[PDB]
């Protein structure tokens, strides 16, 4: 017995029930993934303020 393979039917309706969620705009965006140089230096500058 064969069946259906793929469809996007009803998927966007499902996606909008709790309508598309935009991430929370936060002050002080995370510094993860920034280059470690200028990251340790910023840490040293803050420590010596």
């Amino acid at each position: 017995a064969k069946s259906k393979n793929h469809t996007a039917h009803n998927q966007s309706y499902k996606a909008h029930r709790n309508g598309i969620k935009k991430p929370k705009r936060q002050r002080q965006a995370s510094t993860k993934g920034m280059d470690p140089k200028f990251l340790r230096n910023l840490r040293y500058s803050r420590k010596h303020n």
């Binding site: 996606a15 709790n18 598309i20 969620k21 935009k22 991430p23 965006a29 993934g33 920034m34 280059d35």
Partner: protein, 159 residues
């Protein structure tokens, strides 16, 4: 992976524009990007290091990191229910500064100057944009008027 490679169906997308191949101009290489700036992503197919995935071609995002040969760009991606703020690193060859806020940046300076005048004169003003609306009444002088008529149908001249 899983049926489609990294550069699948990019035959037209990553090709260079017509008669615009070969050397890359120096302007591409000495533009300055800072964290918080807006940039458009446009892959060029002659530079294979730092190449972003085909999804980010034609998307605009914020600069969040700057390295020696690349910048960090933050781009929204809708994945089912929500938007994921994707963070990718792209070489400067595939990125250009965005003009999506150029009209806003000049307007902010002008609104500051206009409100400065209202401070001097003591008035209260708005400096807030308003959409195009209904035109006011006006008069037009008596001039030549051309008459427009439906044209008789001609079979021969239809083609």
């Amino acid at each position: 992976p899983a049926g489609h490679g990294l550069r699948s169906r990019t035959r037209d997308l990553f090709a260079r524009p017509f008669r615009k191949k070969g050397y890359i101009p120096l302007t591409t290489y000495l533009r300055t990007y800072k964290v918080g700036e807006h940039v458009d992503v446009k892959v060029n197919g002659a530079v294979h290091k730092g190449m972003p995935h085909k999804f980010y071609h034609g998307r605009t995002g914020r600069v969040w990191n700057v390295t020696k040969r690349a910048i960090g760009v933050e781009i929204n991606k809708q994945v089912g229910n929500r938007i994921i703020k994707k963070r990718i690193h792209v070489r400067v060859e595939h990125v250009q500064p965005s003009r999506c806020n150029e009209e806003f940046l000049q307007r902010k300076l002008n609104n500051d100057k206009l409100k400065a005048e209202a401070k001097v004169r003591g008035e209260v003003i708005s400096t807030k944009r308003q959409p195009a609306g209904p035109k006011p009444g006006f008069m037009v002088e008596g001039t030549t008027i051309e008459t427009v008529t439906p044209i008789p149908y001609d079979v021969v001249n239809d083609l």
